[PDB]
Design a binder for this molecule. Structure first.
Ligand SMILES: [Cl-]
Ligand code: NA
Length: 335
């Protein structure tokens, strides 16, 4: 028996159903490209269930009794088991609409709304974008300049090298300040497409003005190709810098997307939880909090809108406990 909420079950990094989950996730991604959030969620939930299964699915009988497996998701798995290929998935892969939306949404600073607008305006290629630079934000221009590197998977060793320079800069600016790797790499991934670091200090307030000092140090060492600093107002209400680092390599260098976020230590457990992902895990964890416990969970806190009260967490463990969930370490949140 398989819990319906992704936050109520462990989902390891590696699993037995990658071909089936990948296919369902193509249909999910395509649905989101068309603005069908409902269909996206449905396909993502089906895929996530397969990632939690402790055995490979070899016959359609194994879908029986699983949550989130309606007719459409089931037919997709059936066709892959029976024919090795799913016609609908193959049509999506070959579609100009899907290929273009994937191309554009992968660029730094481009989301679905923008990509869809560009598609409707007749843009198809990266050179089409470069030919219309009046249409681009500074982030997008930087994303296009570095797109080859930025589409190259980031390795765990790259992440290690990056974490060292960030830690050096932080340590030199403010002794006692800490840097914590979050995102998929904290969940144990060996490759990824960007790198996220969360920065805090044990004495609330000592972190004020730290981020610009860190970026100054890194910029002076030649490690920064692009930097956009943003003051506080899902991590958008924290002070943050959107960066492209120039990562040295032997006789060469590679551009790498890195976000740095500063959180006051009181909000650190919530920021860490939020930014550790996976995207589906956190979506479901927030849904659970709201639907089951009537609490609003976000990257800054856990709030009862009716009592106007906040929960003081010291750790991620505290948050799970308060919600009545068994704790899952980051490597089991790969939903
Ligand atoms: Cl994710
Ligand atoms: Na993007």
């Amino acid at each position: 028996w398989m819990p319906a909420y992704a936050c109520q079950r462990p989902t390891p990094l590696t699993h037995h159903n990658t071909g089936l989950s990948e296919a369902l996730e193509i249909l999910a991604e395509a649905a989101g490209f068309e603005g069908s959030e409902g269909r996206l969620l449905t396909f993502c939930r089906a895929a996530s269930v397969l990632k939690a299964l402790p055995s490979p699915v070899t016959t359609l009988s194994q879908l029986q009794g699983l949550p989130h497996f309606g007719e459409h998701s089931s037919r997709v798995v059936q066709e892959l088991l029976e024919h090795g290929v799913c016609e609908e998935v193959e049509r999506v892969r070959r579609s100009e609409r899907y290929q273009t939306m994937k191309l554009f949404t992968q660029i730094f600073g481009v989301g679905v709304k923008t990509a869809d607008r560009w598609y409707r305006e007749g843009l198809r290629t990266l050179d089409d974008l470069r030919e219309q630079p009046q249409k681009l934000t500074q982030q997008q221009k930087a994303g296009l300049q570095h797109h080859q590197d930025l589409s190259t998977p980031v390795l765990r060793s790259d992440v290690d090298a990056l974490q060292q320079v960030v830690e050096e800069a932080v340590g030199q600016a403010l002794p006692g300040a800490t840097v914590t790797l979050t995102g998929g790499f904290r969940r144990g991934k060996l490759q990824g497409h960007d790198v996220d670091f969360l920065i805090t200090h044990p004495k609330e307030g000592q972190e004020a003005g730290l981020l610009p000092r860190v970026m100054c140090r890194l910029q002076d060492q030649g490690l920064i190709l692009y930097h956009q600093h943003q003051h506080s107002c899902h991590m958008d209400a924290f002070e943050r810098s959107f960066c492209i680092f120039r990562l040295p390599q032997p006789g060469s260098w590679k551009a790498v997307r890195v976000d740095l976020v500063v959180a006051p230590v009181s909000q650190f457990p919530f920021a860490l939880l939020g930014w550790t992902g996976s995207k589906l895990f956190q979506r479901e964890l927030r849904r659970f909090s709201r639907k089951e416990k009537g609490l609003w969970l976000n990257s800054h806190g856990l709030f009862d809108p009716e009592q106007k009260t906040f929960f003081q967490a010291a750790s991620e463990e505290d948050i799970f406990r308060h919600l009545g969930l068994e704790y899952l370490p980051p490597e089991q949140r790969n939903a």
